[PDB]
């Protein structure tokens, strides 16, 4: 995902495309985002907006991932705009290493040695700005098995006329190019030692007790944006197939036709006809899904029945800012409705300020002893744009949802849906997965927010949409620990 330039201006981008690009050259940049594309020797800037539900390209489609957006237009050519045909042919790759997992720029040689000694294993590496001779770089790698059976090796990286070397051999136009080369082609030391670059040093994992210290570090000039963008740059390792969602008979069952479930995690419906825009999320498991369509309500209840789910988390109104986000899939209080072969009674509604609880009874028509209570938790106060200012309401919601699920024996996945089921839905699941660790393992536990997002983003596409949501996950964990 080199075509993303994290710290570029429109002028720098035109320059880049005009001097180092050709027609069909393109990159993406933070402005909401901008897609910059060279055409007829001039640059078009296509606007992309994400306020927490999806990436909306002006004059184009809605996407779960910036990578999946580029993938779509590079293969599905002619769909990009005066509506004029704009071609993404040639990515212009970024050489700025700020969004790399192994680039701790301003790290001291001593501090980097301690980190690699306390947190590192065999193959933990990092690149830092040169201690004594500035403009140059140091690759520090840990190798081994106070036994002295392990060691931290330093490797000077020279920057000579905007190219990078380890004192010999090839000269790379970026540190990434050098790292990627010496990953596949490891340096072998005198007396045999192979300086293997296995995994970047983990600096994102903290002990839950020290959340307040980390959130304070990430708030300084911010790290929250720096950490998040390092996470966005790995979304390119999660371009898994979504074939079943693109099939003819299934386009009508997607609310956003390009926000599609991964084939390898999707809820397959049996006894029907097997498709729903829904994915199983396994760290208590979850089904992450989109708000119902008119034509998908019957299939939605088939899923809840099949999966033996007794709890539904809805974090959207039916309508937001004049747009439909989810159909009413539940009866009125005290009423009884049939959704295909599925029968749902609405036993009782209990209103709080932030949410409504609906006690629904679900069953198959013709089969009385198939009946189960399915508790629906409809969060009604989530702001139309962005994230709630105070996390207390969302965590109070989570605590009540967790205690209901825990109370039912042989409960299935907690079904979680918003509009497209990736922004708010992914935010809530991820907060719930993290708070759940601190519940089972106490404040003395290892939490690693981006590890958890990447694991959930490999199960459904774009599972945490915004930096605001990303930050809101930290504030949720901070708040939960504070109130303990
Ligand atoms: C200062 C720096 N250049 C940016 C912050 N940083 C990191 C490191 N690692 C992750 C990470 C952790 C687990 C899984 C995944 Cl996929 C990722 Cl990307 C991350 N998001 N940021 C350190 C380097």
Q: Which residues are annotated as a binding site?
A: 384, 418-424, 465
Which CATH number belongs to the domain containing residue 163 in this structure? Answer: 3.30.505.10
Q: Is 231 in the pocket of ligand 1 (CB under 6 A)?
A: yes
Residue spans of alpha helices (H) in 272-369: 297-307
Domain shared by 86 and 108, yes or no: no
Q: Are residues 91 and 129 located together in one domain of the fold?
A: no
- Is the Cβ–Cβ distance between 29 and 46 less than 8 Å? no
Decide: helix, strand or coil at residue 5.
Answer: coil
Please, what is the angle between helix 467-482 and helix 449-457, to 10°? Answer: 130
Indicate the number of domains in the chain.
3
Q: Which domain holds residue 231?
A: 201-484
| 153 close to 112: Cβ distance less than 8 angstroms | no
Resolution of this entry, Å: 2.6
Q: How far is the CA of 120 from the centre of ligand 1 (A)?
A: 15
Write out the binding residues for substrate: 384, 418-424, 465
Q: Which residue owns the Cα nearest ligand 1 atom 13? A: 451
Last residue of a domain, one of 148, 166, 200: 200
Query: Strand 355-364 and strand 342-351: pairing?
Result: antiparallel
Distance in angstroms (rounded) separating the CA atoms of residues 5 and 19: 16
The answer on 368 and 284 residing in a single domain is yes
Q: Which atom belonging to ligand 1 lies closest to the Cα atom of 97?
A: 3
Judge whether 476 and 237 are in contact, CB under 8 Å. no
The label of the residue with tokens 């304070």 reads 216
- Pocket probe for ligand 1: among 94, 107, 227, the residue whose CB has the most ligand atoms within 8 Å is 227
DSSP 244: G
Nearest CA to ligand 1 atom 1: 104
Whether 101 is in the pocket of ligand 1, judged by its Cβ within 6 Å, is: yes
**445 catalytic per annotation:** no
Q: Which of 230, 235, 430, 456 most suits a substitution to test ligand 1, by most atoms within 8 Å of the C-beta?
A: 230
Same domain for 187 and 320?
Answer: no
Catalytic option among 159, 292, 418, 445: 418
CATH number at residue 463: 3.90.190.10
Cβ(342)–Cβ(328) below 8 Å: no
Angstrom distance (rounded) from CA 298 to CA 275: 12
User: Does residue 204's CB lie within 6 angstroms of at least one atom of ligand 1?
Assistant: yes
104 lines ligand 1 (CB under 6 A): yes
E strand residue ranges, 246-322: 278-281, 286-289, 311-314, 319-320
How far is residue 53's CA from residue 233's CA, in Å, rounded to a whole number?
19
285 and 431 both lie in a single domain: yes
Residue whose CA lies nearest to ligand 1 atom number 14? 451
Together in a domain, 481 and 347: yes
The CB of 232 under 6 Å from ligand 1? The reply is no
Q: Domain check: are 131 and 231 in the same one?
A: no
**Are 475 and 215 within 8 A, CB to CB?**
yes
Ligand 1 probe mutation, 96, 99, 101, 137, most atoms within 8 A of CB = 101
Whole-number Å distance, alpha carbon 103 to ligand 1 midpoint, is 9
Q: What is the distance in A from the centroid of ligand 1 to the CA of 448?
A: 10
The DSSP bridge pattern shows strands 367-379 and 311-314 to be parallel
Report the alpha-carbon distance of residue 326 to residue 333 in Å, rounded.
Answer: 19
- Same domain for 231 and 162: no
Contact (CB, 8 A) for 362 and 372 = yes
Examine the domain organization and report whether 70 and 195 are in the same domain.
Answer: no
Rounded-to-5 percentages of helix, strand, coil across the chain: 30, 25, 45
Measured in angstroms, how far is the CA atom of residue 23 from the centroid of ligand 1? Answer: 34
Query: What beta strand segments (E) does 219-354 contain?
Result: 278-281, 286-289, 311-314, 319-320, 323-324, 336-339, 342-351
Q: How far is the CA of 170 from the centre of ligand 1 (A)?
A: 27
Edge-to-edge strand order for the sheet containing 311-314?
278-281, 286-289, 414-417, 311-314, 367-379, 355-364, 342-351, 336-339
Last residue of a domain, one of 81, 99, 117: 99
Residue 160, helix vs strand vs coil: strand
Gaps in the chain (C–N > 2.5 Å) come after which residues? 31, 81, 145, 221, 272, 283
The response to whether residue 34 sits with its C-beta less than 6 Å from ligand 1 reads no
In short, whether 97's Cβ falls inside 6 Å of ligand 1 is no
CA 231 to ligand 1 center in whole angstroms: 6
> Are 185 and 301 in the same domain?
no
Last residue of a domain, one of 41, 73, 99: 99
Distance CA 37, CA 28 (A): 9
| H or E segment to which residue 454 belongs | helix 449-457
Measured in Å, how far apart are the chain's first and last C-alpha atoms? 41
If asked whether residues 241 and 184 sit together in one domain, one would say no
Q: Kindly state whether residues 148 and 258 are assigned to the same domain.
A: no
User: Which residue's alpha carbon is nearest to atom 9 within ligand 1?
Assistant: 101
Q: How was this structure determined?
A: X-ray
């Amino acid at each position: 995902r080199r075509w993303f330039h994290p710290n570029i201006t429109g002028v720098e981008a035109e320059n880049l495309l005009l001097t180092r690009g050709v027609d069909g050259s393109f990159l993406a940049r933070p402005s909401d985002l901008t897609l910059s594309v060279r055409r007829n020797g001039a640059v078009t800037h296509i606007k992309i907006q994400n306020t927490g539900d999806y990436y909306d390209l002006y004059g184009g489609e809605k996407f779960a991932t910036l990578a999946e957006l580029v993938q779509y237009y590079m293969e599905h050519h002619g769909q990009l705009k005066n509506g004029d045909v704009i071609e993404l042919k040639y990515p212009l790759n970024c050489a700025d290493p700020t969004s790399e997992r192994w680039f701790h720029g301003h790290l001291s040689g001593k501090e980097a040695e301690k980190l690699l000694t306390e947190k590192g294993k065999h193959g933990s590496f990092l690149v830092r700005e040169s201690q004594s001779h500035p403009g140059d770089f140091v690759l520090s790698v840990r190798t081994g098995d106070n036994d002295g059976k392990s060691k931290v090796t330093h490797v000077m990286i020279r920057c000579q006329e905007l190219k990078y070397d380890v004192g010999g051999g090839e000269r790379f136009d970026s540190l990434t190019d050098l790292v990627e080369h010496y990953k596949k082609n490891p340096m072998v030391e005198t007396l045999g030692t192979v300086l293997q670059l296995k995994q970047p040093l983990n600096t994102t994992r903290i002990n839950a007790a020290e959340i307040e210290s980390r959130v304070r570090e990430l708030s300084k000039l911010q790290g929250f944006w720096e950490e998040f963008e390092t996470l966005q740059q790995q979304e390119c390792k999660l371009l898994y197939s979504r074939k079943e969602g693109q099939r003819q008979e299934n386009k009508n069952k997607n609310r956003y036709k390009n926000i599609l479930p991964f084939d390898h995690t999707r809820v397959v419906l049996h006894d029907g006809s097997d498709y729903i825009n829904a994915n199983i999320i396994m760290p208590k498991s979850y089904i992450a899904t989109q708000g119902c369509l008119q034509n998908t309500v019957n299939d939605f209840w088939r899923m809840v029945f099949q999966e033996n789910s007794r709890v539904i988390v809805m974090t959207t109104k039916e309508v937001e800012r004049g747009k439909s986000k989810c159909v009413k899939y539940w009866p009125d209080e005290y009423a009884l409705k049939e959704y295909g072969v599925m029968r749902v009674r609405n036993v009782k509604e209990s209103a709080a300020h932030d949410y409504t609880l609906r006690e629904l009874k679900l069953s198959k028509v013709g089969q009385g002893n198939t009946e189960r209570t399915v508790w629906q938790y409809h969060f009604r106060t989530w702001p139309d744009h962005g994230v709630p200012s105070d996390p207390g309401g969302v965590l109070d919601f989570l605590e009540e949802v967790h205690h209901k699920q825990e109370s039912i024996m042989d409960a299935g996945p907690v079904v979680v849906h918003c509009s497209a089921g990736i922004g708010r839905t992914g935010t809530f699941i991820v907060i719930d997965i993290l708070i759940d660790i601190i519940r089972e393992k106490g404040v003395d536990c290892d939490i690693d927010v981006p590890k958890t997002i990447q694991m959930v983003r490999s199960q459904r596409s774009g599972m945490v949409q915004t930096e605001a949501q990303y930050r809101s996950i930290y504030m949720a964990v901070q708040h939960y620990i504070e109130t303990l």
